[PDB]
Short mmCIF file of C-alpha atoms and ligand atoms in Angstrom, two decimals:
data_model
loop_
_atom_site.label_atom_id
_atom_site.label_comp_id
_atom_site.label_asym_id
_atom_site.label_seq_id
_atom_site.Cartn_x
_atom_site.Cartn_y
_atom_site.Cartn_z
CA UNK I 1 70.46 158.41 107.13
CA UNK I 2 70.72 161.87 108.68
CA UNK I 3 72.61 161.99 111.97
CA UNK I 4 75.93 162.87 113.50
CA UNK I 5 79.26 161.23 112.76
CA UNK I 6 80.57 159.02 115.50
CA UNK I 7 83.32 156.48 116.13
CA UNK I 8 82.42 152.94 117.19
CA UNK I 9 84.69 150.08 118.15
CA UNK I 10 84.41 146.42 117.33
CA UNK I 11 86.15 143.20 116.36
CA UNK I 12 86.53 141.81 112.89
CA UNK I 13 86.29 138.29 111.58
CA UNK I 14 89.88 137.45 112.65
CA UNK I 15 89.34 138.78 116.21
CA UNK I 16 91.16 142.05 115.75
CA UNK I 17 89.84 145.24 117.38
CA UNK I 18 89.35 148.32 115.23
CA UNK I 19 87.58 151.65 115.26
CA UNK I 20 84.84 152.23 112.71
CA UNK I 21 83.12 155.35 111.48
CA UNK I 22 79.44 155.27 112.38
CA UNK I 23 76.43 157.65 112.41
CA UNK I 24 74.19 158.26 115.38
CA UNK I 25 70.46 158.95 115.17
CA UNK I 26 68.62 156.93 117.86
CA UNK I 27 70.73 153.94 116.82
CA UNK I 28 74.35 153.82 115.73
CA UNK I 29 74.56 152.88 112.05
CA UNK I 30 77.40 151.52 109.90
CA UNK I 31 77.51 154.72 107.91
CA UNK I 32 80.93 156.38 107.49
CA UNK I 33 80.44 160.01 106.45
CA UNK I 34 84.18 160.71 106.34
CA UNK I 35 84.75 159.26 102.87
CA UNK I 36 83.06 160.69 99.78
CA UNK I 37 79.32 160.36 99.77
CA UNK I 38 79.58 157.71 102.49
CA UNK I 39 80.27 154.06 103.14
CA UNK I 40 77.15 152.13 104.16
CA UNK I 41 77.01 148.56 105.44
CA UNK I 42 73.85 146.44 105.51
CA UNK I 43 72.53 143.24 107.11
CA UNK I 44 71.19 140.74 104.57
CA UNK I 45 70.05 138.50 107.44
CA UNK I 46 70.93 135.23 105.73
CA UNK I 47 68.67 136.03 102.78
CA UNK I 48 69.40 136.91 99.16
CA UNK I 49 67.26 140.06 99.01
CA UNK I 50 69.53 143.08 98.68
CA UNK I 51 70.70 145.26 100.23
CA UNK I 52 68.85 144.32 103.40
CA UNK I 53 68.74 146.70 106.37
CA UNK I 54 71.24 149.47 107.06
CA UNK I 55 73.20 148.02 109.99
CA UNK I 56 71.82 149.43 113.31
CA UNK I 57 73.42 148.92 116.72
CA UNK I 58 72.20 150.15 120.08
CA UNK I 59 75.53 151.02 121.74
CA UNK I 60 78.24 151.67 119.09
CA UNK I 61 80.16 148.55 120.20
CA UNK I 62 80.45 145.77 117.62
CA UNK I 63 81.94 142.80 119.46
CA UNK I 64 79.25 140.15 118.79
CA UNK I 65 80.15 137.28 116.51
CA UNK I 66 77.23 138.38 114.23
CA UNK I 67 78.80 141.81 113.99
CA UNK I 68 82.26 140.71 112.84
CA UNK I 69 81.62 140.47 109.07
CA UNK I 70 79.94 143.86 109.09
CA UNK I 71 82.88 145.49 110.95
CA UNK I 72 85.34 144.21 108.35
CA UNK I 73 83.20 144.96 105.27
CA UNK I 74 82.79 148.51 106.53
CA UNK I 75 86.41 149.05 107.63
CA UNK I 76 88.05 147.47 104.57
CA UNK I 77 85.79 149.46 102.21
CA UNK I 78 87.32 152.49 103.91
CA UNK I 79 90.86 151.24 103.45
CA UNK I 80 90.13 150.57 99.75
CA UNK I 81 88.64 154.06 99.33
CA UNK I 82 91.77 155.53 100.93
CA UNK I 83 94.06 153.53 98.60
CA UNK I 84 92.35 154.74 95.45
CA UNK I 85 92.15 158.35 96.68
CA UNK I 86 95.62 158.68 98.13
CA UNK I 87 97.54 156.53 95.62
CA UNK I 88 95.63 157.16 92.35
CA UNK I 89 93.73 160.42 93.06
CA UNK I 90 90.47 158.51 92.38
CA UNK I 91 87.40 159.45 94.43
CA UNK I 92 85.50 156.21 95.03
CA UNK I 93 84.85 153.67 92.33
CA UNK I 94 83.22 156.08 89.87
CA UNK I 95 85.71 158.89 90.33
CA UNK I 96 82.96 161.10 91.74
CA UNK I 97 82.67 159.85 95.32
CA UNK I 98 79.85 157.33 94.76
CA UNK I 99 78.53 155.91 98.02
CA UNK I 100 80.01 152.47 98.74
CA UNK I 101 77.34 149.98 99.83
CA UNK I 102 77.99 146.48 101.17
CA UNK I 103 75.78 143.71 102.51
CA UNK I 104 76.95 140.94 104.83
CA UNK I 105 75.35 137.69 105.95
CA UNK I 106 74.28 137.03 102.38
CA UNK I 107 72.47 133.65 102.11
CA UNK I 108 73.49 130.64 104.17
CA UNK I 109 76.88 128.93 103.88
CA UNK I 110 77.80 131.06 100.88
CA UNK I 111 81.45 130.59 99.95
CA UNK I 112 81.86 133.74 97.92
CA UNK I 113 81.67 137.57 97.71
CA UNK I 114 80.92 139.77 94.73
CA UNK I 115 80.21 143.19 93.26
CA UNK I 116 76.73 143.02 91.70
CA UNK I 117 76.90 146.14 89.55
CA UNK I 118 75.62 148.32 92.40
CA UNK I 119 77.07 147.12 95.72
CA UNK I 120 79.33 144.60 97.47
CA UNK I 121 77.86 141.33 98.76
CA UNK I 122 79.57 138.95 101.23
CA UNK I 123 78.76 135.40 102.18
CA UNK I 124 79.62 133.99 105.61
CA UNK I 125 81.25 130.88 104.14
CA UNK I 126 80.47 127.37 105.33
CA UNK I 127 83.11 127.53 108.10
CA UNK I 128 85.34 124.96 106.39
CA UNK I 129 86.16 126.31 102.90
CA UNK I 130 85.70 129.95 103.96
CA UNK I 131 84.99 132.00 106.99
CA UNK I 132 83.10 135.26 106.38
CA UNK I 133 84.70 136.68 103.32
CA UNK I 134 84.86 140.33 104.35
CA UNK I 135 87.63 139.24 106.72
CA UNK I 136 90.03 139.32 103.75
CA UNK I 137 91.18 142.79 102.69
CA UNK I 138 92.26 141.35 99.33
CA UNK I 139 88.75 139.99 98.84
CA UNK I 140 87.10 143.34 99.70
CA UNK I 141 89.51 145.25 97.44
CA UNK I 142 89.22 142.62 94.65
CA UNK I 143 85.50 143.13 94.44
CA UNK I 144 85.53 146.93 94.82
CA UNK I 145 88.07 146.95 92.00
CA UNK I 146 85.36 145.34 89.78
CA UNK I 147 83.37 148.52 90.42
CA UNK I 148 86.37 150.60 89.26
CA UNK I 149 86.72 148.42 86.15
CA UNK I 150 82.99 148.67 85.41
CA UNK I 151 83.23 152.49 85.41
CA UNK I 152 86.43 152.59 83.37
CA UNK I 153 87.63 149.91 80.94
CA UNK I 154 84.34 148.03 81.14
CA UNK I 155 86.03 144.66 80.40
CA UNK I 156 83.38 142.14 79.43
CA UNK I 157 83.25 139.20 81.84
CA UNK I 158 84.14 136.38 79.48
CA UNK I 159 87.18 134.90 77.77
CA UNK I 160 90.33 137.03 77.70
CA UNK I 161 88.70 140.33 78.57
CA UNK I 162 87.10 138.59 81.55
CA UNK I 163 90.41 137.10 82.65
CA UNK I 164 91.95 140.57 82.49
CA UNK I 165 89.00 141.88 84.56
CA UNK I 166 89.72 139.20 87.17
CA UNK I 167 93.49 139.76 87.17
CA UNK I 168 92.97 143.55 87.59
CA UNK I 169 90.92 142.75 90.68
CA UNK I 170 93.57 140.36 92.07
CA UNK I 171 96.36 142.92 91.32
CA UNK I 172 94.64 145.82 93.04
CA UNK I 173 93.32 143.60 95.81
CA UNK I 174 96.93 142.73 96.51
CA UNK I 175 98.14 146.31 96.19
CA UNK I 176 95.44 147.39 98.74
CA UNK I 177 96.63 144.54 101.00
CA UNK I 178 100.18 145.95 100.80
CA UNK I 179 98.87 149.50 101.38
CA UNK I 180 97.21 148.36 104.66
CA UNK I 181 100.45 146.53 105.50
CA UNK I 182 99.07 143.69 107.64
CA UNK I 183 100.62 140.36 106.57
CA UNK I 184 100.79 141.38 102.93
CA UNK I 185 101.54 138.81 100.22
CA UNK I 186 100.98 137.96 96.56
CA UNK I 187 98.40 135.28 97.43
CA UNK I 188 94.60 135.70 97.12
CA UNK I 189 92.13 135.05 99.91
CA UNK I 190 94.47 133.51 102.49
CA UNK I 191 93.00 135.33 105.49
CA UNK I 192 89.54 133.80 105.10
CA UNK I 193 90.26 130.50 103.29
CA UNK I 194 90.33 127.09 105.03
CA UNK I 195 90.64 127.95 108.69
CA UNK I 196 91.85 124.35 109.27
CA UNK I 197 94.89 124.70 106.95
CA UNK I 198 97.85 127.07 107.34
CA UNK I 199 99.48 128.81 104.43
CA UNK I 200 97.10 128.14 101.58
CA UNK I 201 94.93 130.49 99.52
CA UNK I 202 92.38 130.41 96.70
CA UNK I 203 94.77 131.68 94.05
CA UNK I 204 98.45 132.66 93.88
CA UNK I 205 99.96 135.49 91.89
CA UNK I 206 103.52 134.46 92.70
CA UNK I 207 102.91 130.88 91.44
CA UNK I 208 99.46 130.47 89.90
CA UNK I 209 100.23 126.83 89.10
CA UNK I 210 100.16 126.09 92.88
CA UNK I 211 96.33 125.94 92.44
CA UNK I 212 96.34 124.62 88.88
CA UNK I 213 96.05 128.00 87.14
CA UNK I 214 98.17 128.68 84.09
CA UNK I 215 101.37 130.73 84.31
CA UNK I 216 101.99 130.88 80.56
CA UNK I 217 99.77 131.55 77.57
CA UNK I 218 100.59 128.11 76.11
CA UNK I 219 98.74 126.61 79.11
CA UNK I 220 95.62 128.77 78.71
CA UNK I 221 92.18 127.20 79.17
CA UNK I 222 90.15 127.32 75.97
CA UNK I 223 86.82 125.74 77.08
CA UNK I 224 83.50 127.18 78.28
CA UNK I 225 83.58 126.58 82.04
CA UNK I 226 83.96 129.68 84.29
CA UNK I 227 82.84 132.11 81.57
CA UNK I 228 85.69 130.88 79.40
CA UNK I 229 88.19 130.62 82.20
CA UNK I 230 88.06 134.07 83.76
CA UNK I 231 89.44 132.88 87.17
CA UNK I 232 91.76 130.38 85.46
CA UNK I 233 93.46 132.40 82.74
CA UNK I 234 93.77 135.33 85.13
CA UNK I 235 96.84 133.43 86.37
CA UNK I 236 98.75 134.37 83.19
CA UNK I 237 98.19 138.09 83.85
CA UNK I 238 98.65 137.79 87.62
CA UNK I 239 102.06 136.17 86.98
CA UNK I 240 103.05 138.92 84.54
CA UNK I 241 102.09 141.56 87.17
CA UNK I 242 103.99 139.70 89.89
CA UNK I 243 107.09 139.59 87.62
CA UNK I 244 106.85 143.29 86.73
CA UNK I 245 106.85 144.17 90.45
CA UNK I 246 109.07 141.55 92.00
CA UNK I 247 111.23 140.28 89.15
CA UNK I 248 112.33 136.76 88.41
CA UNK I 249 113.27 134.32 85.72
CA UNK I 250 110.24 132.43 84.36
CA UNK I 251 110.45 129.79 81.60
CA UNK I 252 113.98 131.08 80.97
CA UNK I 253 112.98 134.74 80.57
CA UNK I 254 114.49 137.19 83.08
CA UNK I 255 112.47 140.12 84.35
CA UNK I 256 113.98 143.06 86.32
CA UNK I 257 111.47 144.01 88.96
CA UNK I 258 110.42 147.63 89.34
CA UNK I 259 108.36 147.32 92.51
CA UNK I 260 104.72 147.46 93.54
CA UNK I 261 104.12 151.21 93.33
CA UNK I 262 105.22 151.40 89.64
CA UNK I 263 103.20 148.21 88.90
CA UNK I 264 100.17 150.00 90.31
CA UNK I 265 100.82 153.20 88.38
CA UNK I 266 101.25 151.33 85.09
CA UNK I 267 98.21 149.12 85.49
CA UNK I 268 95.97 151.88 86.85
CA UNK I 269 96.82 154.01 83.80
CA UNK I 270 96.30 151.05 81.46
CA UNK I 271 92.94 150.31 83.05
CA UNK I 272 91.71 153.86 83.00
CA UNK I 273 93.10 155.15 79.68
CA UNK I 274 93.89 152.26 77.32
CA UNK I 275 91.72 149.19 77.97
CA UNK I 276 88.27 148.77 76.41
CA UNK I 277 85.40 146.31 76.94
CA UNK I 278 86.82 143.81 74.46
CA UNK I 279 90.57 144.06 75.16
CA UNK I 280 92.46 140.75 74.89
CA UNK I 281 95.78 139.75 76.44
CA UNK I 282 97.84 141.12 73.50
CA UNK I 283 95.99 144.42 73.78
CA UNK I 284 96.66 144.47 77.55
CA UNK I 285 100.37 144.11 76.80
CA UNK I 286 100.15 147.05 74.43
CA UNK I 287 98.19 149.11 76.97
CA UNK I 288 100.78 148.39 79.69
CA UNK I 289 103.66 149.23 77.35
CA UNK I 290 101.99 152.52 76.37
CA UNK I 291 101.19 153.34 79.99
CA UNK I 292 104.79 152.67 81.06
CA UNK I 293 106.01 154.77 78.06
CA UNK I 294 103.73 157.69 79.11
CA UNK I 295 105.06 157.59 82.65
CA UNK I 296 108.74 156.67 82.18
CA UNK I 297 109.75 156.92 78.49
CA UNK I 298 110.08 154.37 75.71
CA UNK I 299 113.71 153.49 76.51
CA UNK I 300 113.08 153.15 80.27
CA UNK I 301 113.71 150.17 82.46
CA UNK I 302 110.01 150.18 83.32
CA UNK I 303 108.97 149.65 79.67
CA UNK I 304 111.71 147.01 79.27
CA UNK I 305 110.43 145.12 82.32
CA UNK I 306 106.80 145.24 81.18
CA UNK I 307 107.92 143.69 77.87
CA UNK I 308 110.02 140.99 79.51
CA UNK I 309 107.17 140.06 81.92
CA UNK I 310 104.69 139.57 79.05
CA UNK I 311 107.38 137.70 77.06
CA UNK I 312 107.90 135.44 80.12
CA UNK I 313 104.19 134.48 80.14
CA UNK I 314 103.97 134.02 76.37
CA UNK I 315 101.83 137.07 75.57
CA UNK I 316 102.99 138.94 72.49
C1 0A9 Y 1 85.91 132.82 92.62
O1 0A9 Y 1 85.46 133.88 93.49
C2 0A9 Y 1 86.09 135.10 93.30
O2 0A9 Y 1 87.36 134.87 93.19
C3 0A9 Y 1 85.54 136.27 94.16
N1 0A9 Y 1 84.11 136.27 93.81
C4 0A9 Y 1 85.75 136.11 95.66
C5 0A9 Y 1 87.17 136.19 96.10
C6 0A9 Y 1 88.01 137.24 95.78
C7 0A9 Y 1 89.30 137.25 96.28
C8 0A9 Y 1 89.76 136.21 97.11
C9 0A9 Y 1 88.91 135.14 97.42
C10 0A9 Y 1 87.60 135.16 96.92
C1 0A9 Y 2 91.84 119.24 88.49
O1 0A9 Y 2 91.81 120.42 89.33
C2 0A9 Y 2 92.49 120.34 90.53
O2 0A9 Y 2 92.36 119.13 91.15
C3 0A9 Y 2 92.29 121.64 91.27
N1 0A9 Y 2 92.52 121.40 92.72
C4 0A9 Y 2 93.30 122.63 90.69
C5 0A9 Y 2 94.72 122.02 90.72
C6 0A9 Y 2 95.17 121.27 89.64
C7 0A9 Y 2 96.45 120.70 89.64
C8 0A9 Y 2 97.26 120.87 90.74
C9 0A9 Y 2 96.81 121.62 91.81
C10 0A9 Y 2 95.55 122.18 91.83
C1 0A9 Y 3 88.45 124.25 91.50
O1 0A9 Y 3 88.94 125.55 90.94
C2 0A9 Y 3 90.28 125.57 90.73
O2 0A9 Y 3 91.06 124.86 91.55
C3 0A9 Y 3 90.82 126.85 90.12
N1 0A9 Y 3 92.26 126.92 90.43
C4 0A9 Y 3 90.51 126.66 88.64
C5 0A9 Y 3 91.01 125.33 88.06
C6 0A9 Y 3 90.21 124.20 88.10
C7 0A9 Y 3 90.64 122.96 87.60
C8 0A9 Y 3 91.90 122.86 87.03
C9 0A9 Y 3 92.68 124.03 86.97
C10 0A9 Y 3 92.27 125.24 87.47
CA1 CA Y 4 76.45 146.65 120.06
CA1 CA Y 5 98.00 138.43 103.60
CA1 CA Y 6 96.61 138.20 100.04
CA1 CA Y 7 93.74 128.32 105.22
ZN1 ZN Y 8 86.40 138.86 90.67
#
């Protein structure tokens, strides 16, 4: 909507206070004009019709329990925008400052969040498996990274290409989590998962097997569930990315870590220059090797570490 840019204050899902960019015109709206063509957050009102209503508030204070998911969806979309712009010189998900739209309070008891090809959508959770999912910066960044993938590599959401798609979202969701620098880790979804249990998460990059996901190609899932294992076999790629950044010895193969920023540079280049809709795990290895060669040279430590990490997870 047309109005003037303002600054509201509210509390997120975890009870933390933050400022949010709003727009005033009779009401205060969750519309951040400071980033690209805007960030816009909507109320789905417990329904599945999308997007719902642009979020309107009478006083520019967002401290109600109902408000919390909206505050975080809005704020963490901004953080994600800032990561891509400042770290990768990418203007929104399309590279041309596309407006970022999100809806909260999707359905009732919905234990998930997703990019639907056009916008972000967040459930509130059932209160036991999940609390509202926009409370997790890694969740917000995971699903906005699907938008980036859709506009770039276009990885089809099935089998190995789909597992790469998922892993790319877990990798950049994590890198955004580190960028924001609040309790960062190599785990996925911890901030909003199982409020009754400390220290767990939905997936782990550091040890995918913690949650039953493979950490080596020899353990890959070959059946039809989960679109051919897209959230399962992502563990093989997530482990390779973790090893590239952090290092380690895995199934007897030693990897010299090169740190998170180089991991991000290599994988962002691979995603945006070298992956295609049908890329498999072997082709991802090749893309990462070429990306690292472009950036650092064929004889570099960075290239050597990318090779060892894929060796360590059984991907040739
Ligand atoms: C299976 O659901 C998926 O993984 C995402 N749709 C939601 C999610 C992302 C990141 C962390 C937690 C949840
Ligand atoms: C069969 O699937 C399991 O029961 C899931 N909880 C995944 C898992 C497997 C093995 C160990 C830990 C977690
Ligand atoms: C329930 O979803 C799971 O726990 C995921 N970790 C996928 C999985 C299922 C079963 C066995 C292994 C992996
Ligand atoms: Ca208010
Ligand atoms: Ca964390
Ligand atoms: Ca995390
Ligand atoms: Ca928990
Ligand atoms: Zn995903």
